[PDB]
Amino acid sequence: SMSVKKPKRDDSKDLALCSMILTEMETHEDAWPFLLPVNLKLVPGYKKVIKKPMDFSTIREKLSSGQYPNLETFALDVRLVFDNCETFNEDDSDIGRAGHNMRKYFEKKWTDTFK
Amino acid sequence: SMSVKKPKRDDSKDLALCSMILTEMETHEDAWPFLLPVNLKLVPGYKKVIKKPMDFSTIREKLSSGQYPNLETFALDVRLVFDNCETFNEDDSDIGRAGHNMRKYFEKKWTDTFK
Numbered sequence A, B: 001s002m003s004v005k006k007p008k009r010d011d012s013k014d015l016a017l018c019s020m021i022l023t024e025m026e027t028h029e030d031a032w033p034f035l036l037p038v039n040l041k042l043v044p045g046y047k048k049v050i051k052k053p054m055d056f057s058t059i060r061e062k063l064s065s066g067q068y069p070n071l072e073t074f075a076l077d078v079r080l081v082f083d084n085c086e087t088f089n090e091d092d093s094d095i096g097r098a099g100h101n102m103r104k105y106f107e108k109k110w111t112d113t114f115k
């Protein structure tokens, strides 16, 4: 509360560490469905169904331009990518499996890096 | 943003300074309408009309028990006292004038102490 602070966790390296993690995401062989925005003009249903589209290039732009106020907002956007993927794609599809693989991949790097 | 911090204003004395200011509020001769909660069982209209009743003793209790997360939440409750007073009392009444005097009194101590 007022004049009562929790010990401040060191966050000075978060920007660099999230960038590193995103780089490993981008270079994963199953990253291809998530590198660019889904094309809203060509994919039926997607614009109406997926209220908040997200992808790695958009996350990269936001990270590079100071649009994540903290660790958690970055993680929320990464998870949003995979939540969207689950909403729109069957689990037993190439893209569906990609999403599951990438989410697993992310959450490990996230745990290892910050926990 | 992430790993980009504004210079941190020193807030370690805020709890003590707000306590000092509240003490001067409490000891002001026109503080008497605001020292204790308005009696909701005896004052017609007050419970229905005034959605968030506030008074100095309640503010004192909240301050002493770590219920203000920061400077501003404390100031919001003090102002709430006088906003309520304006809502319920005519300007040309003893209590009405008291409220105006106390608000002026507070805002000066607030400006002088933290600005």
Ligand SMILES: CO[C@H](O)CCc1ccc(O)cc1
Residues within 6 Å of the ligand: A033, A034, A038, A043, A084, A085, A088, A089, A095
């Ligand atoms: C993250 O990528 C997408 O969700 C792809 C959605 C999609 C599925 C099948 C198609 O033929 C076209 C687009």
Ligand SMILES: CO[C@H](O)CCc1ccc(O)cc1
Residues within 6 Å of the ligand: B033, B034, B038, B043, B084, B085, B088, B089, B095
């Ligand atoms: C902050 O004190 C109050 O607003 C008092 C409201 C009130 C006005 C006249 C009365 O006869 C009783 C209560």
